[PDB]
Ligand binder design. Structure first.
Ligand SMILES: *[C@@H]1O[C@H](CO)[C@@H](O[C@@H]2O[C@H](CO)[C@@H](O)[C@H](O)[C@H]2NC(C)=O)[C@H](O)[C@H]1NC(C)=O
Ligand SMILES: *[C@@H]1O[C@H](CO)[C@@H](O[C@@H]2O[C@H](CO)[C@@H](O)[C@H](O)[C@H]2NC(C)=O)[C@H](O)[C@H]1NC(C)=O
Ligand SMILES: *[C@@H]1O[C@H](CO)[C@@H](O[C@@H]2O[C@H](CO)[C@@H](O)[C@H](O)[C@H]2NC(C)=O)[C@H](O)[C@H]1NC(C)=O
Ligand SMILES: *[C@@H]1O[C@H](CO)[C@@H](O[C@@H]2O[C@H](CO)[C@@H](O)[C@H](O)[C@H]2NC(C)=O)[C@H](O)[C@H]1NC(C)=O
Ligand SMILES: *[C@@H]1O[C@H](CO)[C@@H](O)[C@H](O)[C@H]1NC(C)=O
Ligand SMILES: *[C@@H]1O[C@H](CO)[C@@H](O)[C@H](O)[C@H]1NC(C)=O
Ligand SMILES: *[C@@H]1O[C@H](CO)[C@@H](O)[C@H](O)[C@H]1NC(C)=O
Ligand SMILES: *[C@@H]1O[C@H](CO)[C@@H](O)[C@H](O)[C@H]1NC(C)=O
Ligand SMILES: *[C@@H]1O[C@H](CO)[C@@H](O)[C@H](O)[C@H]1NC(C)=O
Ligand SMILES: *[C@@H]1O[C@H](CO)[C@@H](O)[C@H](O)[C@H]1NC(C)=O
Ligand SMILES: *[C@@H]1O[C@H](CO)[C@@H](O)[C@H](O)[C@H]1NC(C)=O
Ligand SMILES: *[C@@H]1O[C@H](CO)[C@@H](O)[C@H](O)[C@H]1NC(C)=O
Lengths: 270, 413, 238, 208
C-alpha cells in the first residue's frame, strides 16, 4: 500500500506479472496431480452392506460412518499441518472428505469386483475366487489358496493389525509426508523474514525511510529495498517451480502404481 | 479481464485479474519549565547575559507562538509552527534586558555596541529570537557595555524589553527535547491507518487476548510481524490483524458464448464488497447456487465448481455415478459380448529450439555498452550455453521417441 | 517471436521426415506385430496376429476367428469416430497446444522487457548514450544492463525447468511406444483404458499422438459359481 | 578469587513480546560458565557493559559511580540507593578516597551538573543487575532473586546520557562482577512471554 514504492515497480516492467503467473501454473498443476492419481474410477462403488469377503477382515481398511477409514484417521494424526501480507494459500479443488471418497471407491472395487472394475464394467466376484486368480498370476496353482484359505485369511488379518500398530506406536513413519509440509512452511517462513532485511538501505522499513527523506534521496534508498525484495521473491518462486517438478514426478509415479497395482495385478518385481 | 489477458475474446474458465483490499479509514494516533524563562520575575543585564540549558522533557512550542504575549517573535531555520514536531539534543536560552531600538541587534550579522560588546551571536542559525515589552513591570538597574547603564523611564525605542534567545543542539547526542505528540482517539473492529508512536502500519485493531509484561510496548510473532501493542498514552493492550484482502477472479463461459460473468473473491467474510453466496473458498457474486450436483466444469475450490440455461451456476461437483455392485459369494458376473474401441493419448516431445544472443539482447550494435557487459564476465556464455544445451537435447527427444526402427518398412500395396 | 538478437533454431527432423518414421512404425505393427521390434521382421497374416493378441489378454484365440467380421466392423467404425471426434471438437490437442503457448509467451514477455526503464532516464540504449557523456551515461547504462540481465536470467531458468518437464514427458512417450507399439503391454491402464491389444503412433508438430486399441468387456450376465466341484470324493479344480 | 556463572546473565534484549517460539538474537551477554570474580571497593574496568550481582543482605552496597575520570575533570554518575528512592545524578562530583554510604560523603562537588533523575527504590536474597552502554543510550537491567539456576533480567530504565563510562567502582558484604561479550543466544520465550531457557551459541560443540 505504498503509492511512491509502486511508481518504482512499474519501471521494472512485467516482473510481478511473470512471477504471479508462475505461482498460478503450479497451483493449477497441484489440482491436477490429485485429479490424475485418485480419479481412476468413473463411478463411486460402495462396499456391500453385508460383509462376507471369504474371511478376510476389511473393517480397518474401509470407512467407518462414525466419523474416512480407521487407518486414514490415524494418518491425519501423525502430520503437523502462515500468511500476513501479500501471501495467501489457496484451497484444493478436492477436499479431504472428497478424496477419501475416491479411495473408499477404488478400495470397494478391488475387493468386490477384482481388477475389472477399473478395466471395463465392474464384475462382481466372490473374494476368495478373486484371490485364487491372483495366486495363479504369481505362479502358484489356484488350489493352494482354497486348501489353505483359513491360514491365509488369518495371516492377512494379523498383518493388517501390525501396520495399525506400526503406524500409531512408531512416530516418524511418515517422513516423506512431513518433509513436504515442513519444506513448504520453511519456504514461506524464510520469505517473510526477508522483509526485515536491510539490503544496504538506511532502514529495512519502507514507511520510515520515506517518512524522513526527501523524494530524491528517498528513491535511491527505496530502489535498494525493492531490488532486494524482488530478488527474494524470484528466489522463492524459482525454488517452488523446482520443488513442484519433483512433486509432479512423485505424483506421476503414484498414478502409475495405483493404476497397475490397485486397478489390477502388477507382475514386475519389486 | 479482457485487458489483463490482452485479448478481445477470453476463453471459458476462471481467470485472476487483480487483488483487492479494504482501504483504511479514520486513522488514529498513538514538560520543560518554560515558565521560569519567559515568566521570570527578574532578568539580568545584557553585558552579563544569563543562559540556562533546557532539556529532558516534551515541550509544546505553540503556547508562546500562537498567542500574543510577545511583541517580537522571529524564528530561523524552522518555521515557528513546526517546532512541536521536531526533536532536539538540547535547548539553550539566553536572557537579558535591553533598550527597544537595540532589539534589532539580536541577530546574526549585526553590528553595534550591543552586537559587538554585550551579546554576540555566531554566523549560524538560531532557534527563535523572542522579545516583549517590559516597561510595565521593570521601569537604571541594567547595564550595557567600559559599561553604561540604561535610562529606562516609564514616561518606545528607549523602553526596556525582556529578550529570550533560544538555541537548539542538533544531532550532537540522542535527542532529549521534542514537541508533543497530539494523539487522537482510537477505534476498534475496523481496518485503520495507525501510527503507534514510531510504528506506522495497517490492519484491524481489536481488544487483544495475550498478556504482556510491564516492560513490553508491542510484540511480534514471526519476522517482525507485530501482533499486539500496548498503547503508551492510554495503557491498553490491543491486537493487530490485517484487514481482509485477497485475489479476485472471474468465471466465464467464454467471450463469444455469453457476456455473463461471475466474480469470485478469495478468502473473505462476504459481509461487504446482483446475487450473493458464500463458499469455503470465498464468496461468489453473480453465480446462482444450485442444490444438485454435476461434473466439475469450471473449478473454484473446496469441491465447488461453476453456464446452464442462460445463466451461471455454482455447485458441489459429483464424483461419479453412485452404483453398488451386488456382491455374492456364490455368484459371478461375466461378459457375454465385447466392444473393441480406440483411444487417443497425446504427449509432447519437443519445444522450439530457442537461441538468444546476449551481447545483442543487452546492448546490440553498441561498442561502448558491451564494454560494460565485459565487467559481468561469462554471464552470457553460461546463458548462451545453457540454452544451447536444451536445444541440443530437443533433437534427442524426437530421435529417442521416433527413431526406434532399425530401418524403414513399407506397407504392401 | 524473434526480431532483436532472438532466433529459433530449426529442428533436425522435419515434419515430413518424422511422418516417415511413424509410417515405418505402424507399417510394421500391421505386418509383424511385436516381433519386428526385437529382431528381424516376420510377416504374419493380420488376423492371426490379432488372434494371438487376444490370447495375450486371456481370451481363447478362437473367439476372434468366430467373430472376425464383427471385430473388423467395430474397429473401423471406431477409427472413423476418431477422425470425426478430432475434426470438430476444439481443444482436442490442448495438451499439445499448451507447450506452444508457453514457449510463445516466454518469448513475448522477454521481448517486452526491452521497453522497461529499470530506473533509467530512458528505456532505449541509443537515446541515453546519444545525449550523455560516457561518465554519466555509463551509470544510466549500468542500471539498464543489470535489469536486462536479470530478465534474461529469469528466462533461461524457466526454460531449463520447462525443458526438464518435457524431458520427462519425452521419456514417457518413448517408453509407451516401446511397450505398446513395438509390443503388447500387460500392465493395466497404461496405454489407454481397457485391455491393451494394439496401438499406433501418429505424428504431431511438437508431440506424438497414439491410437490405443483395447478389448473391453460388455453385456455381462449373472452366474452362480463354486470354488471347485466334488466327484467321487475328489475336488476338481478348473 | 573466581567463581562459575553457570547460566546466569540472560536478560530481555528488547521490549518485544513472544510466545512459545525460539528467537536467536545477538547482543552483549555474559558467557555461560564464565569466570566470575567474587570480590569481598576497588575501581574496575567497564569494557562494554558489566554484569553485576550480589547476595549480601546489607545496606553496605548502596550505589555505584560511573564515569571516565570519576573526578571534577568529567561528568560522572552517582547512582545511589537512598533507601526510600533511587537517586541518580550525572553532576561533576570530585573523587573520594573512600566514600562511605549512617552518613554520606560522596557528593563532593556539582560543577556544571546537567542531569538528575529519581524513581522508586530497588531494594538468602540474590540481586542481579546488568549495565550496558549503547550508542549513547545508557540502559540498566535488574531482577530480584531469593548462584546455581537460570533466570532472566528485566529492564528498569533507559537513560539518554551519551557519556564515556570506563570505571564503575561500586560504593561502600560480597558482590560478583562479570563482563559482557557479543554472543549470539537462542532465547526461549514461554507461553507467558517470559524467558525460560537459553542456548549459548559458542559455548560447546553441541550448543553450536
Ligand atoms: C475385523 O477386525 C476388527 C479389528 O478392529 C474387529 O473389530 C474388533 O473386534 C474385537 C473383538 O473381535 C473388539 O474387541 C474390537 O473392539 C473391535 N474393533 C472395533 C469395533 O473397532 C472386527 O470385529 C473384525 N470383523 C470381522 C468380521 O472379522
Ligand atoms: C506354515 O506356517 C503357518 C504360519 O506361518 C503355520 O500355521 C500356524 O500353525 C501353527 C501350528 O499348527 C500354529 O502354532 C501357528 O500359530 C499358526 N499360525 C497361523 C497364522 O495360523 C503352519 O502350521 C505352517 N505349516 C503348514 C504346513 O502350513
Ligand atoms: C445380478 O443380480 C443382482 C441382484 O439380483 C443385480 O443387482 C440388482 O439389480 C437390480 C435390477 O437391475 C437393481 O435394482 C438392484 O439395485 C441391484 N442391486 C441389488 C439388488 O443388490 C444385478 O444387476 C444382476 N446383474 C445383472 C447385470 O443383471
Ligand atoms: C455384441 O454386440 C454387437 C454390437 O455391435 C452386436 O452386433 C450387432 O448385432 C445386432 C443384432 O444382431 C445387429 O443389428 C448389428 O448390426 C450388429 N452390429 C455390428 C457392428 O455388427 C453383436 O450381435 C453382439 N453379440 C452378442 C452375442 O450379443
Ligand atoms: C505567564 O503567566 C501568564 C499569566 O498567568 C500566562 O498566561 C502565561 O502563559 C505564562 N507563561 C508561561 C510560559 O507559562
Ligand atoms: C465460440 O468460438 C469457438 C471457436 O471459434 C467455438 O468453438 C464456440 O462454439 C463458439 N461459441 C459460440 C457460443 O458460438
Ligand atoms: C462473518 O462474520 C460473522 C460475525 O463474526 C459471522 O457470524 C459469520 O458467520 C461470518 N461468515 C463466515 C462465512 O464465516
Ligand atoms: C436446496 O436445499 C436446501 C436444503 O435445506 C433447501 O432448504 C433449499 O430450499 C433448496 N433449494 C433448491 C432451489 O432446491
Ligand atoms: C533521601 O531520602 C531522604 C528521606 O527519605 C530525603 O530527605 C533526601 O532528600 C533523599 N535524597 C538524598 C539523601 O540524596
Ligand atoms: C557541561 O558539561 C557537559 C558534559 O560534558 C558539556 O557538554 C557542556 O559543554 C558543559 N558546559 C559547561 C558550561 O561547562
Ligand atoms: C570517549 O573517549 C574517546 C577517547 O579516544 C573519545 O574519542 C570519544 O569521543 C569519547 N566519547 C564521548 C562520548 O565523549
Ligand atoms: C502462563 O502460562 C501458564 C502455563 O502455560 C498458564 O497456566 C498461565 O495461565 C499463563 N499466564 C500466567 C502469566 O499465569
Amino acid at each position: 500500500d505504498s503509492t511512491e514504492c509502486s511508481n518504482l515497480l512499474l519501471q521494472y516492467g512485467s516482473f510481478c506479472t511473470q512471477l504471479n503467473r508462475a505461482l498460478t501454473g503450479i497451483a493449477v498443476e497441484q489440482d491436477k496431480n490429485t485429479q490424475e492419481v485418485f480419479a481412476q474410477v468413473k463411478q463411486i462403488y460402495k462396499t456391500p452392506p453385508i460383509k462376507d469377503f471369504g474371511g478376510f477382515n476389511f473393517s480397518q481398511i474401509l470407512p467407518d460412518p462414525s466419523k474416512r477409514s480407521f487407518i486414514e484417521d490415524l494418518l491425519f494424526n501423525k502430520v503437523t499441518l502462515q500468511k500476513f501480507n501479500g501471501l495467501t494459500v489457496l484451497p484444493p479443488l478436492l477436499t479431504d472428505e472428497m478424496i477419501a471418497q475416491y479411495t473408499s471407491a477404488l478400495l470397494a472395487g478391488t475387493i468386490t469386483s477384482g481388477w475389472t472394475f477399473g478395466a471395463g464394467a465392474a464384475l462382481q466376484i466372490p473374494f476368495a475366487m478373486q484371490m485364487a486368480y491372483r495366486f495363479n498370476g504369481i505362479g502358484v496353482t489356484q488350489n493352494v489358496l482354497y486348501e489353505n484359505q483359513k491360514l491365509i485369511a488369518n495371516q492377512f488379518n494379523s498383518a493388517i493389525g501390525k501396520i495399525q500398530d506400526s503406524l500409531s506406536s512408531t512416530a516418524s513413519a511418515l517422513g516423506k509426508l512431513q518433509d513436504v509440509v515442513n519444506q513448504n512452511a520453511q519456504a514461506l517462513n524464510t520469505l517473510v523474514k526477508q522483509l526485515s532485511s536491510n539490503f544496504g538501505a538506511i532502514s529495512s522499513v519502507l514507511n520510515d525511510i520515506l517518512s524522513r527523506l526527501d523524494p530524491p534521496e528517498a528513491e535511491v534508498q527505496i530502489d535498494r529495498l525493492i531490488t532486494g525484495r524482488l530478488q527474494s521473491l524470484q528466489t522463492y518462486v524459482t525454488q517452488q517451480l523446482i520443488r513442484a517438478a519433483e512433486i509432479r514426478a512423485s505424483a506421476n509415479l503414484a498414478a502409475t502404481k495405483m493404476s497397475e497395482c490397485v486397478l489390477g495385478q502388477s507382475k514386475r518385481v519389486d | 479481464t479482457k485487458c489483463t489477458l490482452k485479448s478481445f475474446t477470453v476463453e471459458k474458465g476462471i481467470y485472476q485479474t487483480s487483488n483487492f483490499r479494504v482501504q483504511p479509514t479514520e486513522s488514529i494516533v498513538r514538560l520543560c519549565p518554560f515558565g521560569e524563562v519567559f515568566n521570570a520575575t527578574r532578568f539580568a543585564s545584557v553585558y552579563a547575559w544569563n543562559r540556562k540549558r533546557i532539556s529532558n522533557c516534551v515541550a509544546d512550542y505553540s503556547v508562546l507562538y500562537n498567542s500574543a504575549s510577545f511583541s517580537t517573535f522571529k524564528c530561523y531555520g524552522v518555521s515557528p509552527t513546526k517546532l512541536n514536531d521536531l526533536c532536539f539534543t538540547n535547548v539553550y536560552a539566553d536572557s537579558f534586558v535591553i533598550r527597544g531600538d537595540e532589539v534589532r541587534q539580536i541577530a546574526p550579522g549585526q553590528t553595534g555596541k550591543i552586537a559587538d560588546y554585550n551579546y554576540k551571536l555566531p554566523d549560524d542559525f538560531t532557534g527563535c529570537v523572542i522579545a516583549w515589552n517590559s516597561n510595565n513591570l521593570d521601569s537604571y538597574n541594567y547595564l550595557y557595555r567600559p559599561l553604561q547603564s540604561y535610562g529606562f523611564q516609564p514616561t518606545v525605542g528607549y523602553q526596556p524589553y525582556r529578550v529570550v534567545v533560544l538555541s537548539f543542539e542538533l544531532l550532537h547526542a540522542p535527542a532529549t527535547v521534542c514537541g508533543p505528540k497530539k494523539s487522537t482517539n482510537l477505534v476498534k473492529n475496523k481496518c485503520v491507518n495507525f501510527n503507534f508512536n514510531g510504528l506506522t502500519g495497517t490492519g484491524v485493531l481489536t481488544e487483544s487476548n495475550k498478556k504482556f509484561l510491564p516492560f513490553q510496548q508491542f510484540g511480534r510473532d514471526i519476522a517482525d510481524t507485530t501482533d499486539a501493542v500496548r498503547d503508551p498514552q492510554t495503557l491498553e493492550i490491543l491486537d493487530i490483524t490485517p484487514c481482509s484482502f485477497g485475489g479476485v477472479s472471474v468465471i466465464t463461459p467464454g467471450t463469444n458464448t455469453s457476456n455473463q460473468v461471475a466474480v469470485l473473491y478469495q478468502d473473505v467474510n462476504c459481509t461487504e464488497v446482483s446475487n450473493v453466496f458464500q463458499t469455503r473458498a470465498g464468496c461468489l457474486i453473480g453465480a446462482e447456487h444450485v442444490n444438485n450436483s454435476y461434473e466439475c466444469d469450471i473449478p473454484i475450490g473446496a469441491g465447488i465448481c461453476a453456464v446452464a440455461s442462460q445463466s451461471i451456476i455454482a455447485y458441489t461437483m459429483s464424483l461419479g455415478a453412485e452404483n453398488s455392485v451386488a456382491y455374492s459369494n456364490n455368484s459371478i458376473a461375466i461378459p457375454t459380448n465385447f466392444t473393441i474401441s480406440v483411444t487417443t493419448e497425446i504427449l509432447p516431445v519437443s519445444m522450439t529450439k530457442t537461441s538468444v544472443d546476449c551481447t545483442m539482447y543487452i546492448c546490440g550494435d553498441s561498442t561502448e555498452c558491451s564494454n560494460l557487459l565485459l565487467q559481468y564476465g561469462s554471464f552470457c556464455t553460461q546463458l548462451n550455453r545453457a540454452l544451447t544445451g536444451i536445444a541440443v537435447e530437443q533433437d534427442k527427444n524426437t530421435q529417442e521417441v521416433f527413431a526406434q526402427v532399425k530401418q524403414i518398412y513399407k506397407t504392401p500395396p | 517471436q524473434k526480431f532483436n538478437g532472438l532466433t529459433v533454431l530449426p529442428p533436425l527432423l522435419t515434419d515430413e521426415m518424422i511422418a516417415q518414421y511413424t509410417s515405418a512404425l505402424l507399417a510394421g505393427t500391421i505386418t509383424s506385430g511385436w516381433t519386428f521390434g526385437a529382431g528381424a521382421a516376420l510377416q504374419i497374416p493380420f488376423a492371426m496376429q490379432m488372434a494371438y493378441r487376444f490370447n495375450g489378454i486371456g481370451v481363447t484365440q478362437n473367439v476372434l476367428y468366430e467373430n472376425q467380421k464383427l471385430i473388423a466392423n467395430q474397429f473401423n467404425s471406431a477409427i472413423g469416430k476418431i477422425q470425426d471426434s478430432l475434426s470438430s471438437t476444439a481443444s482436442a490437442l490442448g495438451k499439445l497446444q499448451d507447450v506452444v503457448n508457453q514457449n510463445a509467451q516466454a518469448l513475448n514477455t522477454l521481448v517486452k522487457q526491452l521497453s522497461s526503464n529499470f530506473g533509467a532516464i530512458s528505456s532505449v540504449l541509443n537515446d541515453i548514450l546519444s545525449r550523455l557523456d560516457p561518465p554519466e551515461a555509463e551509470v544510466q547504462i549500468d542500471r539498464l544492463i543489470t535489469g536486462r540481465l536479470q530478465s534474461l536470467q529469469t528466462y533461461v531458468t524457466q526454460q531449463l525447468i520447462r525443458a526438464a518437464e518435457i524431458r520427462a514427458s519425452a521419456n514417457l512417450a518413448a517408453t509407451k511406444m516401446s511397450e505398446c507399439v513395438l509390443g503388447q503391454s500387460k500392465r493395466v491402464d497404461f496405454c489407454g483404458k481397457g485391455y491393451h491389444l494394439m496401438s499406433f503412433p501418429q505424428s504431431a508438430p511438437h508431440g506424438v499422438v497414439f491410437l490405443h486399441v483395447t478389448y473391453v468387456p460388455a453385456q455381462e450376465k449373472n452366474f452362480t459359481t463354486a470354488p471347485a466341484i466334488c466327484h467321487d470324493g475328489k475336488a476338481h479344480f478348473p | 578469587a573466581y567463581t562459575n556463572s553457570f547460566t546466569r546473565g540472560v536478560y530481555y534484549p528488547d521490549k518485544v513480546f513472544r510466545s512459545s517460539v525460539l528467537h536467536s538474537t545477538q547482543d552483549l551477554f555474559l558467557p555461560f560458565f564464565s569466570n566470575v570474580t567474587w570480590f569481598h571497593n576497588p575501581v574496575l574496568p567497564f569494557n562494554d557493559g558489566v554484569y553485576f550481582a550480589s547476595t549480601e543482605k546489607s545496606n553496605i552496597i548502596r550505589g555505584w559511580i560511573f564515569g571516565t575520570t570519576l573526578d571534577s575533570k568529567t561528568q560522572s554518575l552517582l547512582i545511589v540507593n537512598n533507601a526510600t528512592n533511587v537517586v541518580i545524578k550525572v553532576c561533576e562530583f570530585q573523587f573520594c578516597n573512600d566514600p562511605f554510604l549512617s552518613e554520606f560523603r560522596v557528593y563532593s562537588s556539582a560543577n556544571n551538573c546537567t542531569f538528575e533523575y529519581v524513581s522508586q527504590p530497588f531494594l538468602k536474597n540474590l540481586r542481579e543487575f546488568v549495565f550496558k552502554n549503547i550508542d549513547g543510550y545508557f540502559k540498566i537491567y535488574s531482577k530480584h532473586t531469593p548462584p546455581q539456576g537460570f533466570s532472566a533480567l528485566e529492564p528498569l530504565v533507559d537513560l539518554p546520557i551519551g557519556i564515556n563510562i570506563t570505571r564503575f567502582q561500586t560504593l561502600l558484604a560480597a558482590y560478583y562482577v562479570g563482563y559482557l561479550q557479543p554472543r549470539t543466544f537462542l532465547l526461549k520465550y514461554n507461553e507467558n512471554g517470559t524467558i525460560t531457557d537459553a542456548v549459548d551459541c559458542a559455548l560447546d560443540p553441541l550448543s553450536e
